[PDB]
Amino acid sequence: GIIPVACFDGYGGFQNTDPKTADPIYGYVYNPSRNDCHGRYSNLLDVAEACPTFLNFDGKPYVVTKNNGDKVMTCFDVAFTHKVHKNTFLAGLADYYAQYQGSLNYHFMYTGPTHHKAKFMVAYIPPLPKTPEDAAHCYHSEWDTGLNSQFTFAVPYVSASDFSYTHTDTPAMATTNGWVAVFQVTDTHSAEAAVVVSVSAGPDLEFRFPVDPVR
Amino acid sequence: GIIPVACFDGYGGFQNTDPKTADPIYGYVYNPSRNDCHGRYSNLLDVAEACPTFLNFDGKPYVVTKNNGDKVMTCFDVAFTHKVHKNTFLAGLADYYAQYQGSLNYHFMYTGPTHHKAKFMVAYIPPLPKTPEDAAHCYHSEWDTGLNSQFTFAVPYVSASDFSYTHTDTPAMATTNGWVAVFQVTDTHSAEAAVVVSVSAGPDLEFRFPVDPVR
Amino acid sequence: GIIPVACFDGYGGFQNTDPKTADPIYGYVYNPSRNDCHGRYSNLLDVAEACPTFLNFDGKPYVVTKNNGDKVMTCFDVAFTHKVHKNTFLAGLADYYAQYQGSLNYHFMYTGPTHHKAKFMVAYIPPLPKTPEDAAHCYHSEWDTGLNSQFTFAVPYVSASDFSYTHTDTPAMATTNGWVAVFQVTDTHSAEAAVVVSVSAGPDLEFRFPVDPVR
Amino acid sequence: VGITYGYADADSFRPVEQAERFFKEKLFDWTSDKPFGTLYVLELPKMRNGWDVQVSATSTQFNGGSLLVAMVPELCSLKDREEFQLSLYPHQFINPRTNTTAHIQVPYLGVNRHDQHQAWSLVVMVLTPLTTEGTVEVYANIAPTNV
Amino acid sequence: ENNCPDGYSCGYRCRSGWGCSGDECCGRRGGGWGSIELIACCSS
Amino acid sequence: KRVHTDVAFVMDRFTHVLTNRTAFAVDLMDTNEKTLVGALLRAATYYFCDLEIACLGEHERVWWQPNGAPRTTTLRDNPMVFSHNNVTRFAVPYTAPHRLLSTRYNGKLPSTFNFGYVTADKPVDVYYRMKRAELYCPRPLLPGYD
Amino acid sequence: KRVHTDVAFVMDRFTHVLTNRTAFAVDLMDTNEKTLVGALLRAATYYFCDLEIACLGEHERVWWQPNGAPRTTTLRDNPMVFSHNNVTRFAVPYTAPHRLLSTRYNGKLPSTFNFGYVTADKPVDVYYRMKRAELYCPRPLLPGYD
């Protein structure tokens, strides 16, 4: 009338991530409800997608048009560890996750007088030349600040591996993640304008393997 | 309300081949797929049947025709521990298995000039005379190098026991496994040629009882 | 999420006759077959019923006819510990069992000249007079060596208890098991003859409680 | 004799790719002085592409021998007794009397779906020494497929 | 009878670059592990 | 039907890989090249499996970090398993970013080909077990002993 | 489908919160602000969970009063759990009078934002686990390390 068992060795230790639940003390409690509450989010990446956060261009989120002839306002990596992405919610999430894969959306907002109309382009240079002609064979898009002062550029995932490491150390490596660059196709610059740049997670982005960083 | 059990003595130790699984750490991982990958093999012997590997005839895989009158180019055993089979994939696979049973296929390829046509007979001598007439009452087969320069010689399993021992010590024992030998019936030899010999597992061969050799 | 159990005291010790099985090492082995093998016996007493074994009449299995007037050739008990049954298969099988119950079949074979015909009667004397008239009220039977020189004498189980004891010590006790005796009714003895006697288990015999004799 | 598709898919052959570029190069002088085991390894390339190599030799009716032409994936090195098992790889035999020409096609192979890294190496081994009764040359034609 | 050389059997779909109307080629397993060899088309 | 030569059957075994170590990568190439599991693993160009790590010895707990996590001396709230009867057995998922792992690489294997990092309170002996092992592109196999 | 970044999945982990304390409140803000559980908790304005407490160390037994119960040195018949193998794991139901708890408060957090009070026989190391966590009103999250 006794079930024969055998206590195996190896199992039974205290695991901090075990699926097993514990024995409650007050097992007959019934908290009323939280259905009609506001702001509940059940997934961090949904928040990351729905809430773009600004970039860090030397302490400021905006880039200023230059009078000198270079046709390159900005050229920044697509790495979460890069100082440009240092102050983003995506970088905050990436610090606690080992791996990631997917696309990003970069939002550009023009911040100049309504009379001054400018046309910009944004190019993603996969793992590099910095000219529009060589970017024509690359993934480039162009938007004019006369229709909508709000542009979204979708940076896809073209990394060699299926997943990429969130933690790395590459200052300006030619193969960091793709070197998103912004060019001003119009050389007839009038005055000092400003472009605000922010980042958000793409619809297909996915982090994995949460990690406690103890660096 | 408590199930009465009894922890038996004898069970519970760490077995290195136990069927029981362990408790995962990250239990909600989903690796994408490996369906469209190439070269997958789910059975070791399936690889050995479709991949014949050459024999070791004193450092070479081929056999040189002799001008002297002996009518025996080679006479090698059918043992995986023999120096002839030492370099084959089957012998490498047999070193990790205690026992085996089944048939072997021996592939012969003639690599001589196209003008010179020779006729060869392959005889199997179960556990011994070395003459074609005495091999007529035994297993034998003859192929002429004028139709196909590729011959397959299936070697039946005629061991006394149901299974044979992969590991043994028989240099040239008369009862090793059957003494596969190659006889050239044409005494009108013209010049030097070669015969490449390779062995592949038969459709019914089966190894068992994996063993780690610590000899 | 944890099943509450309680390891009872008393169970879990190593029993040498426990019904529980162990954990196999190579759990995927498949021995081919033993169906077409010969001589398999799944029950020990089935062997004893179909294989009569001879008795020990002072080192010989036969009985010599006596010229003197006694009308008795042998008077042996029906106990497996008696020196008569010492060499039988039943006694050898009874040494490892504590108790038994059932009937015994005694086979008598006449090995004399064909011209000499003798009539013998076999009497069973339940727990004692040694005369045919007193044996008439008891169990007895008579066979003539002119029809079949092979006689079977079933000995019924008339012990007081339901089961008897295989191990005991009764040399010639009047209540041992029934004192099977052989009487020759013909006083016209001609010459010396022999009667081979053997015992086989009855169809209803049953041993029980296997034991290891460490006497 | 024919065209060999190494690591082919069984379902794909139940009842596309093509060579884009082209190239030719002489490999070695097939001579009798080279015994068995005279390896010649050529890494490829010398983009997620499959290769297609047509190794050919110039042999007549008076030429005899055998070459084993294979494509080893990630051939770091070959051990002493490893050559005898080269037939474990997508391979063909060049015999002067049978085909005197090889042709092997292999798909893209790697841990990732995009390659930089010599994934494949064309290995030519002299299975039997050359025999005659006037030199034999080996030329390899390599062409990427589905770049 | 099947029109294939010795050791070659039909039932193998022709890969791109053969020009077989019936898409049946004289396939032949060999040349390594998983290798499939095609030499010509299949005619019935 | 042949069962004992099936890859999923053969590779499903605990093989002793390293002795008396406290912190170590979980590179599956740490296996002995002459053992059954190691020899049959090195006979394949590519592979994929979910591992099981068993640590035997006097130790209190074992921390495991997935592949790609930064290497630090002290691990806090990382996946931790306490030893029971001086045995710590736990199943490690395939955490590599690549679709498949490779035994060889025509570039030494880069650091990305491992199942993570493991630290222990005290040095332990480690056993690896390949669950649901898959092998690709068979390679030459030679007899380890004569 | 993304699984590893789900709130109900990430917070379901035992995080080390405090070391060598015999009597302590069960406030959920004692978590380290740089850990995975601690940092993501502070990235939400409001939350709700059924806490699980684990005590590791040499202790015979541990007590637990619900939120609002008076603080006393000696405890009689209060919810008490004995340690098995020097581990005491028990599930604490949500206890605060408020519908939801908050990390920040524009009014230091008042004492009513806790899951109770725990006194141990001897000092122990305490681990918190958030069962069925529900975060609200996400707040800025920053990289802990550079």
Number of strands of chain D: 9
Strand content of chain A: 25-35%
Strand coverage percent of chain D = 35-45%
Helix coverage percent of chain D: under 10%
- Rg of chain A to the nearest angstrom? 24 Å
Helix/strand order of chain A: EHEEEHEEEHEEEEEE
Oligomer: part of a larger assembly
How would the global form of chain A be characterised?
elongated
Number of helices, where a helix is a run of at least 4 consecutive DSSP H or I residues of chain A: 3
The CATH class of chain A is Mainly Beta
Give the number of DSSP strands of chain A: 13
Percent helix range of chain A: under 10%
Main sheet: strands, sense, barrel of chain D: 5 strands, mixed
Order of helices and strands of chain D: EEEEEEEEE
Distance between the termini of chain A: 56 Å
Protein name (chain D): Genome polyprotein
Function (chain D): Replicates the genomic and antigenomic RNAs by recognizing replications specific signals. Performs VPg uridylylation.
Subcellular location (chain D): Host cytoplasmic vesicle membrane; Host endoplasmic reticulum membrane; Host nucleus, Host nucleolus; Virion
Family (chain D): Belongs to the picornaviruses polyprotein family.
